[PDB]
Amino acid sequence: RTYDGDGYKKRAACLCFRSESEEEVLLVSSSRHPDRWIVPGGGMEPEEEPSVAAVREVCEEAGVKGTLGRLVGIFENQERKHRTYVYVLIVTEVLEDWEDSVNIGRKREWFKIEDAIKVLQYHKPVQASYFE
Ligand SMILES: O=P(O)(O)O[C@H]1[C@H](OP(=O)(O)O)[C@@H](OP(=O)(O)O)[C@H](OP(=O)(O)O)[C@@H](OP(=O)(O)O)[C@H]1OP(=O)(O)O
Numbered sequence: 001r002t003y004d005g006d007g008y009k010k011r012a013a014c015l016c017f018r019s020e021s022e023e024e025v026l027l028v029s030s031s032r033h034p035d036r037w038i039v040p041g042g043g044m045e046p047e048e049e050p051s052v053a054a055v056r057e058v059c060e061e062a063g064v065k066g067t068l069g070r071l072v073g074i075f076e077n078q079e080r081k082h083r084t085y086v087y088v089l090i091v092t093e094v095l096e097d098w099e100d101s102v103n104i105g106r107k108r109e110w111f112k113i114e115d116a117i118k119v120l121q122y123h124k125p126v127q128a129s130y131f132e
Pocket residue numbers: 009011029030031032033038041042043080082
């Protein structure tokens with residue numbers, strides 16, 4: 001795990017959209033609580049570029065690849081002490097049997113943006129804000 005100078009854990013994530021119209025986004029199930037949804041993402045490795053970490057974590061957690069788009073922003077979770085670079089990713093490859101599917105049975109699902117914001121709100125309000 002890696003950290004900013006203030007001790008916040010460094011993370012990266014993508015908003016994995018179905019298309020360039022950015023109407024449908026891919027969430028993945030929580031590892032702790034499989035009945036809940038999150039935005040896929042995770043820790044940056046040492047010296048790892050945030051865009052590289054984002055794409056790698058989406059591949060591991062969600063089993064997708066695509067065309068990397070713009071940095072949306074950098075988002076803090078004060079409560080959990082982490083700070084997340086969030087990028088747009090336009091999905092072009094949907095893989096079966098990806099890392100977390102095989103290892104922890106992680107699920108994924110497409111959501112209209114409105115619905116994504118809805119299911120994120122309760123446990124992951126900072127993640128809901130990614131879409132603002
Ligand atoms: O507190 P939790 O509900 O168990 O959330 C955990 C935890 O997030 P926190 O940093 O807030 O504790 C993990 O972070 P660490 O404990 O490893 O620092 C995070 O891991 P990543 O930052 O690497 O994403 C993991 O997410 P996941 O295991 O899917 O990678 C996520 O669990 P959820 O899947 O329920 O959000």
